[PDB]
């Protein structure tokens, strides 16, 4: 509800922007498909299997609303997105592999922010 | 505008096309080419009404919306003889599995 210390908010945005603007070795923006969830009337089987749905838009919304109170609270929601992606989608598919790299990029972005 | 016609004379059917702006006389020339009978020896009909040579097909009632390639308009033809349109053969009774 109330705003978190400005350093924390700036730290949260720096990590999320690094994860969203990330380009893999092939030069692709991996976050693109994870920005917005599939529509409930478009893929209802998603909301049937995924009990706690989340996307990069919902994560960015929780930073500005100050719903996350720490870098851990932010990490838990990014791990959940990647886990949900790895649950619904088949192993070996491009989307599945893309969620592995994004999850790793988050850990690297978090560690670089902690070092500063 | 193009009109699609079925010219009927007894057991003869000519399938042809023309313009709405084309005359009855012009249609008679097409019939002349096929059936080798001069336009003076010809009588053309629409819904059993005789058609004047000077009139366009559009003036006679033949329109593109009603004279379609897949549903041509009927043109009655008689020679220098009563206008006679002989019915075609009939399909069999519709099968029970098609009912």
């Amino acid at each position: 509800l109330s705003p978190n210390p400005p350093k924390l908010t700036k730290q949260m945005n720096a990590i999320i922007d690094t994860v969203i603007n990330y380009k893999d070795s092939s030069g692709r923006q991996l976050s693109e498909v994870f920005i917005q969830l599939p529509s409930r009337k478009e893929l209802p089987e998603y909301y049937e299997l995924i009990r706690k749905p989340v996307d990069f838009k919902k994560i960015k919304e929780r930073i500005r609303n100050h719903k996350y109170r720490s870098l851990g609270d932010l990490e838990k929601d990014v791990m959940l997105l990647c886990h949900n992606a790895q649950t619904f989608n088949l192993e070996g598919s491009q989307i599945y592999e893309d969620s592995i790299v994004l999850q790793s990029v988050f850990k690297s972005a978090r560690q670089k922010i902690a070092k500063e | 505008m193009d009109v699609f016609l079925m010219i009927r004379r007894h057991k003869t059917t000519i399938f042809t096309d023309a313009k709405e702006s084309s005359t009855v006389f012009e249609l008679k020339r097409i019939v002349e080419g096929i059936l080798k009978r001069p336009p003076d020896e010809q009588r053309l009909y629409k819904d059993d009404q005789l058609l004047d040579d000077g009139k366009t097909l559009g003036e006679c009632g033949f329109t593109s919306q009603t004279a379609r390639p897949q549903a041509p308009a009927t043109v009655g033809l008689a020679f220098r003889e009563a206008l006679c349109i002989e019915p075609f053969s009939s399909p069999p009774e519709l099968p029970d599995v098609m009912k």
Binding site: - | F4, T12, T13, G33, R68, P69, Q70, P72, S89, M98
Partner: protein
Amino acid sequence: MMYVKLISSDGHEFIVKREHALTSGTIKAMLETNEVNFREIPSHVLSKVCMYFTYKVRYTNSSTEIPEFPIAPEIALELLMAANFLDC
């Protein structure tokens, strides 16, 4: 000349443009000269086939919207036999 005569099993003659009759490979093979007799195809079926030739010539490789070729349920089977025979 520009027209061919197709005669039905029951005696009816159908005079169509050469271009229209050429839709059928079977008719090409069959082509008094410019006259083709069908001992198996009746007049209600042959008429529909000629309407199909007109429809096909007019709408093939044309930019305009294409309407449905109508087929009443009662002729469907005989028209199926004739089209398979004529290869059109």
